[PDB]
């Protein structure tokens, strides 16, 4: 018997996938998680006692982004091992393709929280290899189900590319993506490229956005905005066609924007 339901914060959430919590935790009807320190517990009574004792009201690590009540904490897997392992166990309940939960030292974790009077409430995260040979600027990215399709995933994707810009590099998420992640990345790439084309070579868009040339090219192909000439992809778009694409409803929702001015981060 696996964990099939969690209580975290004020949410009850059904599991989507197997996550390797210890056997005696999976057997329980529900797993109870402290939303601040991510300790998982077997019983409502141990949960209620913990909530009166726990002094955490936000993730550990350094707050590298704060604008209004939106916050991002950077958490080193080597500095906060247990927390990052519990985060990976939580994430695995909603990610099919995540395979690493306990060897968290090679990773840095970026925790998105929404803050109110009581504390900073976890929304989602992405992990990232301290050293990525493959040029991946995201390893795994997960938004908890009650926050999905509400702009938080768009914020986290945009945030991962802001880090890449500061690192003077391009990057791409590690594959395979979840289905929602796949849809979200394609819409993000489209929105960014169309906006830049409205206001360039493929190499130019790559340096401006930190999106890889491959991801630009596949996105421009899906939009039918590229020609091919003697082995080279070439941007082929009229300023009117760009506007028409931005009209589509899928870009109508107002984003939670990443304000470069509020990002407190120096590249390693
Ligand atoms: C278990 C998987 O967890 C995830 C993972 C990722 C990467 C997600 F993005 C999400 C999510 O919740 N996506 N929906 S979104 O944030 O509203 C959104 C995202 C991109 C947009 C681009 C352009 C215009 C609007 C957009 C809205 C959930
Ligand atoms: Na649910
Ligand atoms: Zn706690």
UniProtKB/Swiss-Prot annotation:
User: What does the entry report about post-translational modification of this chain?
Assistant: Acetylation at Lys-98 facilitates cognate substrate Lys-binding and acetylation. Although considered as an autoacetylation event, acetylation at Lys-98 probably takes place via a non-enzymatic process following acetyl-CoA-binding, which primes KAT8 for cognate protein-lysine acetylation. Deacetylated by SIRT1.
- GO-annotated biological processes: dosage compensation by inactivation of X chromosome; myeloid cell differentiation; negative regulation of DNA-templated transcription; negative regulation of epithelial to mesenchymal transition; negative regulation of type I interferon production; neurogenesis; oogenesis; positive regulation of DNA-templated transcription
Impact noted for substituting residue 174 to Q: Abolishes histone acetyltransferase activity without abolishing non-enzymatic 'autoacetylation'. Abolished ability to regulate mitochondrial gene expression
Which chain segments does UniProt annotate as zinc-finger regions (C2HC MYST-type)?
A: 31-56
Which reaction does this chain catalyze?
Answer: L-lysyl-[histone] + acetyl-CoA = N(6)-acetyl-L-lysyl-[histone] + CoA + H(+); L-lysyl-[protein] + acetyl-CoA = N(6)-acetyl-L-lysyl-[protein] + CoA + H(+); propanoyl-CoA + L-lysyl-[protein] = N(6)-propanoyl-L-lysyl-[protein] + CoA + H(+)
* Protein's UniProt keywords contain Translocase: no
Binding of propanoyl-CoA, residues: 141, 143, 149, 153-154, 178, 187
**Impact of mutating residue 140 to S?**
Strongly reduces histone acetyltransferase activity without abolishing non-enzymatic 'autoacetylation'
Active site residues according to the UniProt entry: 174
Judged by the first EC level, this protein's enzyme class is transferase
The annotated region (Sufficient for interaction with KANSL1) lies at: 1-268
Record note on what altering residue 149 to C does: Found in a severe neurodevelopmental disorder similar to Li-Ghorbani-Weisz-Hubshman syndrome with apparently autosomal recessive inheritance; uncertain significance; no effect on protein expression; no effect on localization to the nucleus; no effect on MSL complex assembly; decreased histone acetyltransferase activity
Q: Please give the residue positions where the record annotates the modification N6-acetyllysine.
A: 98
Q: Where does Zn(2+) bind?
A: 34, 37, 50, 54
| Binding residue positions for acetyl-CoA | 141, 143, 149-151, 153-154, 178, 187, 228, 252
State the EC number(s): 2.3.1.48, 2.3.1.-
Q: What's one GO MF term for it?
A: transcription coactivator activity
One GO term of the cellular component aspect?
mitochondrion
Residues modified as Phosphoserine: 172
Notes on how activity is controlled: The acetyltransferase activity is inhibited by anacardic acid derivatives.
**The family this protein is said to belong to:** Belongs to the MYST (SAS/MOZ) family.
Assembly and partners are described as: Component of a multisubunit histone acetyltransferase complex (MSL) at least composed of the MOF/KAT8, MSL1/hampin, MSL2L1 and MSL3L1. Component of the NSL complex at least composed of MOF/KAT8, KANSL1, KANSL2, KANSL3, MCRS1, PHF20, OGT1/OGT, WDR5 and HCFC1. Component of some MLL1/MLL complex, at least composed of the core components KMT2A/MLL1, ASH2L, HCFC1, WDR5 and RBBP5, as well as the facultative components BACC1, CHD8, E2F6, HSP70, INO80C, KANSL1, LAS1L, MAX, MCRS1, MGA, MOF/KAT8, PELP1, PHF20, PRP31, RING2, RUVB1/TIP49A, RUVB2/TIP49B, SENP3, TAF1, TAF4, TAF6, TAF7, TAF9 and TEX10.
User: Tell me, what does this protein do in biology?
Assistant: Histone acetyltransferase that catalyzes histone H4 acetylation at 'Lys-5'- and 'Lys-8' (H4K5ac and H4K8ac) or 'Lys-16' (H4K16ac), depending on the context. Catalytic component of the MSL histone acetyltransferase complex, a multiprotein complex that mediates the majority of histone H4 acetylation at 'Lys-16' (H4K16ac), an epigenetic mark that prevents chromatin compaction. H4K16ac constitutes the only acetylation mark intergenerationally transmitted and regulates key biological processes, such as oogenesis, embryonic stem cell pluripotency, hematopoiesis or glucose metabolism.
Associated disease: Li-Ghorbani-Weisz-Hubshman syndrome: An autosomal dominant disorder characterized by global developmental delay, mild to moderate intellectual disability, speech and language impairment, and variable facial dysmorphism. Some patients have seizures and autistic features. Brain imaging abnormalities are observed in some patients and include decreased white matter volume, enlarged ventricles, thin corpus callosum, and gray matter nodular heterotopia.
- What is the official name of this protein in its record? Histone acetyltransferase KAT8
Give the encoding gene's name: KAT8
